[PDB]
Design an enzyme around this catalytic site. Structure first.
Site, short mmCIF file in Angstrom:
data_model
loop_
_atom_site.label_atom_id
_atom_site.label_comp_id
_atom_site.label_asym_id
_atom_site.label_seq_id
_atom_site.Cartn_x
_atom_site.Cartn_y
_atom_site.Cartn_z
N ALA A 30 0.81 -1.21 0.00
CA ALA A 30 0.00 0.00 0.00
C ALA A 30 0.84 1.27 0.00
CB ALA A 30 -0.93 0.01 1.21
N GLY A 31 2.08 1.19 0.49
CA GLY A 31 2.93 2.36 0.55
C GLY A 31 3.32 2.93 -0.80
N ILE A 32 3.12 2.18 -1.89
CA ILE A 32 3.43 2.76 -3.20
C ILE A 32 2.24 3.48 -3.80
CG2 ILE A 32 5.08 0.88 -3.57
CD1 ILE A 32 3.28 0.14 -6.11
N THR A 34 -0.06 5.41 -1.65
CA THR A 34 -0.56 6.49 -0.81
C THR A 34 -0.30 7.84 -1.44
OG1 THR A 34 1.47 6.30 0.46
CG2 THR A 34 -0.49 5.16 1.31
N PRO A 39 -5.55 5.54 0.28
CA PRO A 39 -5.05 5.25 1.62
C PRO A 39 -4.86 3.76 1.85
CG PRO A 39 -6.97 6.70 1.67
CD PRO A 39 -6.90 6.11 0.30
N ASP A 40 -3.93 3.45 2.75
CA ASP A 40 -3.72 2.09 3.24
C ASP A 40 -4.76 1.81 4.30
OD1 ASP A 40 -2.88 -0.33 4.29
OD2 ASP A 40 -1.01 0.44 5.10
N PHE A 41 -5.76 0.99 3.99
CA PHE A 41 -6.79 0.81 5.00
C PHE A 41 -6.29 0.06 6.23
CE2 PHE A 41 -7.84 -2.50 1.70
CZ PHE A 41 -7.37 -3.60 2.39
N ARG A 42 -5.05 -0.42 6.24
CA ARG A 42 -4.44 -1.00 7.43
C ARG A 42 -3.69 0.02 8.27
NH1 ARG A 42 -3.17 -4.78 3.41
NH2 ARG A 42 -4.30 -6.77 3.58
N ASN A 109 -1.80 -4.75 -3.68
CA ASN A 109 -2.79 -3.70 -3.88
C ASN A 109 -3.89 -4.13 -4.83
OD1 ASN A 109 -1.06 -2.20 -2.30
ND2 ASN A 109 -0.20 -1.04 -4.02
N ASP A 111 -5.88 -1.63 -6.37
CA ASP A 111 -6.29 -0.36 -6.98
C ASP A 111 -6.10 -0.29 -8.49
OD1 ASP A 111 -3.45 0.03 -7.31
OD2 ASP A 111 -3.36 1.12 -5.40
N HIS A 128 -3.53 -10.16 -3.56
CA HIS A 128 -4.78 -9.97 -2.85
C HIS A 128 -5.94 -9.73 -3.81
CE1 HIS A 128 -2.22 -8.65 0.86
NE2 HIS A 128 -2.14 -9.95 0.60
N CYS A 136 -19.34 -13.06 -11.76
CA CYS A 136 -20.48 -13.80 -11.23
C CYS A 136 -20.01 -14.86 -10.24
CB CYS A 136 -21.24 -14.46 -12.39
SG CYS A 136 -22.58 -15.47 -11.83
N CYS A 141 -21.57 -20.47 -13.75
CA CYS A 141 -21.62 -19.33 -14.67
C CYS A 141 -20.29 -18.60 -14.72
CB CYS A 141 -22.77 -18.40 -14.27
SG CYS A 141 -22.93 -16.96 -15.35
N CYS A 165 -27.43 -14.93 -15.18
CA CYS A 165 -28.07 -15.79 -14.19
C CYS A 165 -28.58 -15.06 -12.95
CB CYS A 165 -27.10 -16.90 -13.74
SG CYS A 165 -25.77 -16.32 -12.67
N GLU A 229 9.53 2.84 6.89
CA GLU A 229 10.10 2.21 8.07
C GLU A 229 10.84 0.93 7.69
OE1 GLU A 229 6.63 2.26 7.64
OE2 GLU A 229 6.31 4.26 8.49
C1 LIG Z 1 -13.68 0.75 -4.54
C2 LIG Z 1 -12.34 0.77 -5.21
C3 LIG Z 1 -12.19 0.61 -6.57
C4 LIG Z 1 -10.91 0.59 -7.10
C5 LIG Z 1 -10.67 0.43 -8.57
N1 LIG Z 1 -9.83 0.71 -6.32
C6 LIG Z 1 -10.08 0.86 -5.01
S1 LIG Z 1 -8.69 1.08 -3.96
C7 LIG Z 1 -9.46 1.78 -2.46
C8 LIG Z 1 -10.01 0.84 -1.41
O1 LIG Z 1 -9.40 0.63 -0.36
N2 LIG Z 1 -11.23 0.31 -1.69
C9 LIG Z 1 -11.84 -0.73 -1.01
N3 LIG Z 1 -13.01 -1.16 -1.40
C10 LIG Z 1 -13.42 -2.19 -0.58
C11 LIG Z 1 -12.58 -2.55 0.43
C12 LIG Z 1 -12.81 -3.63 1.42
C13 LIG Z 1 -12.18 -4.97 1.07
C14 LIG Z 1 -12.91 -6.14 1.19
C15 LIG Z 1 -12.33 -7.37 0.90
C16 LIG Z 1 -11.01 -7.44 0.48
C17 LIG Z 1 -10.28 -6.27 0.36
O2 LIG Z 1 -8.98 -6.29 -0.08
C18 LIG Z 1 -8.41 -7.55 -0.43
C19 LIG Z 1 -7.51 -7.98 0.67
C20 LIG Z 1 -7.57 -9.09 1.46
N4 LIG Z 1 -6.52 -8.99 2.29
N5 LIG Z 1 -5.83 -7.87 2.05
N6 LIG Z 1 -6.44 -7.26 1.05
C21 LIG Z 1 -10.86 -5.04 0.65
S2 LIG Z 1 -11.17 -1.54 0.37
N7 LIG Z 1 -11.27 0.90 -4.40
ZN LIG Z 2 -23.86 -15.58 -13.75
#
Ligand SMILES: Cc1cc(C)nc(SCC(=O)Nc2ncc(Cc3cccc(OCc4c[nH]nn4)c3)s2)n1
Ligand SMILES: [Zn+2]
Length: 291
Positions: A30-32, A34, A39-42, A109, A111, A128, A136, A141, A165, A229
């Protein structure tokens, strides 16, 4: 008998432009992104009750998604980036590709910025998963949908349903409860036989199995960390970790600062600064001019 003449960015650059360094694996997190505004949701400063979840983690879990997908898609709309402009780090990897040096980019990432920057499917292991495609969820399907379709569904607040479906359509990200893509393990088993340099950028190496990748490198392979870090050393309580600083260190280098600034410094040592500047400014202008 080590491959780096000194444990510094300058030593790594000299190694990269020697005949000994032909195949680079990048491990990025995620650091590449930000500095692209993602944002890094962690990271806690950028880490909800509006979604009335049975427990907070449920919005990331696959069984909950398949029964109650609306919270996930509302969160996806809330988190959807306003623009997709890859960073200097992303385009540095594109230059590695252009110069025939990039064996593989493993990314944490979701993104899609690696693809926007011009890395192709063959170049990438999205460990990830990714938003780039969706499927689907019905096993009989599995219709694939592009991000344009999923984005329209997300922003119109229409729960995405398969046109064939009417099952749910899920972004190809790895929810909790799903296994990592098989591609991750297949590629790891082949790539780490072939690597000359591991470039680790923008990851704390704390999430598994991605972190354990650094232990898969051959004993001689230099490992350069570009990160805010120091990361990847053995934990003194829980403990092929990084050895940057002991008298026995021989191949691991830590450049501590912003990832874009470290990649710029490396490119500059390599004589690539003008190429990288031209590439980034052109691609950023193109993205800014999308109509
Ligand atoms: C919406 C969007 C579109 C586009 C092109 N780009 C972005 S990027 C920004 C970002 O955060 N977005 C998020 N939407 C949902 C998230 C939750 C979530 C759930 C399940 C696995 C997740 O991630 C896999 C994983 C598993 N373990 N580690 N990672 C994340 S987070 N956002
Ligand atoms: Zn389907």
């Amino acid at each position: 008998e080590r491959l780096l003449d000194e444990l510094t960015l300058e030593g790594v650059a000299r190694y990269m432009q020697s005949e000994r360094c032909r195949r680079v694996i990048c491990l990025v997190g995620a650091g590449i992104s930000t500095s692209a505004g993602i944002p890094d949701f962690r990271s806690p400063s950028t880490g909800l009750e509006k979604y009335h979840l049975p427990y907070p983690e449920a919005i990331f879990e696959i069984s909950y998604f398949k029964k109650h997908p609306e919270p996930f898609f509302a969160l996806a709309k809330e988190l959807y980036p306003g623009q997709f402009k890859p960073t200097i780090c992303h385009y540095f990897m594109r230059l590695l590709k252009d110069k025939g040096l990039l064996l593989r980019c493993y990314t944490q990432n979701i993104d899609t910025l690696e693809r926007i920057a011009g890395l192709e499917q063959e170049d990438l292991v999205e460990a990830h998963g990714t938003f780039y495609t969706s499927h689907c969820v019905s096993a009989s399907c599995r219709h694939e949908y592009p991000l344009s379709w999923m984005k329209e569904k997300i922003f119109s607040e229409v729960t995405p349903k398969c046109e064939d479906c009417q099952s749910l359509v899920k972004p190809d990200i790895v929810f909790f409860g799903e296994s990592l893509p098989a591609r991750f393990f297949s590629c790891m088993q082949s790539d780490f036989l072939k690597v000359d340099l591991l470039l680790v950028m923008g990851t704390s190496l704390q999430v598994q199995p991605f972190a354990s990748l650094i232990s898969k490198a051959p004993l001689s392979t230099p490992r350069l960390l570009i990160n805010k870090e120091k990361a990847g050393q053995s934990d003194p309580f829980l403990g092929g970790g990084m050895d940057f600083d002991s008298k026995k260190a021989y191949r691991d280098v830590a450049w501590l600062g912003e990832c874009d600034q470290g990649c710029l410094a490396l490119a500059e040592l390599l004589g690539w600064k003008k190429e990288l500047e031209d590439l980034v400014r052109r691609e950023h202008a193109s993205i800014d001019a999308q109509s």
